[PDB]
């Protein structure tokens, strides 16, 4: 962790286009739009509402470091993703077919690209059958 705690702060204040210790939530709506997102101001104010645990909106990484210091791979956020398959499960066992996973992948929430969702179920359907099991996916999401 000693080799990443220095150069990350170069990207932390990179959105403000200056040297100030600011996460720049007002300028994040221009930085992400320059990247090609262009969100609304309601979702933009919702970003640092839970990302920045301080509460101001622009920070010298109390929680911008803690956002990096949350690996999202241990057993505290591995069952919450495993519950997201359970909302789609019918008749138990994690039955989810490639057709049903493509049906739910390109339709709801924040949709993926077709070049992403076409190959997303590829490593989770190595047997080629009609059941993309959740345990074969969270094992791929174990390093996420």
């Amino acid at each position: 962790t000693e080799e990443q705690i220095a150069e990350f702060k170069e990207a932390f204040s990179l959105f403000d286009k200056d040297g100030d210790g600011t996460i720049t939530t007002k300028e994040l709506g221009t930085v992400m739009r320059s990247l090609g997102q262009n969100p609304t101001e309601a979702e933009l104010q919702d970003m640092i509402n839970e990302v920045d645990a301080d509460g101001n909106g622009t920070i010298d990484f109390p929680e911008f470091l803690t956002m990096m210091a949350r690996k999202m791979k241990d057993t505290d956020s591995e069952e919450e993703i495993r519950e997201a398959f359970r909302v789609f499960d019918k008749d138990g066992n994690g039955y989810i077919s490639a057709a049903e996973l493509r049906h739910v992948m390109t339709n709801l929430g924040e949709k993926l690209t077709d070049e992403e969702v076409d190959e997303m179920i590829r490593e989770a359907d190595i047997d080629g059958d009609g059941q993309v099991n959740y345990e074969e996916f969270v094992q791929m999401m174990t390093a996420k």
Binding site: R86, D89, G92, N93
Partner: peptide
């Protein structure tokens, strides 16, 4: 009256996934 699984929503699955281990 077909929505009567509203006390045992996750309970029918939380035993079977335990049973598979």
């Amino acid at each position: 009256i077909e929505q009567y699984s509203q006390g045992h929503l996750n309970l029918m699955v939380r035993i079977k996934e335990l049973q598979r281990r």
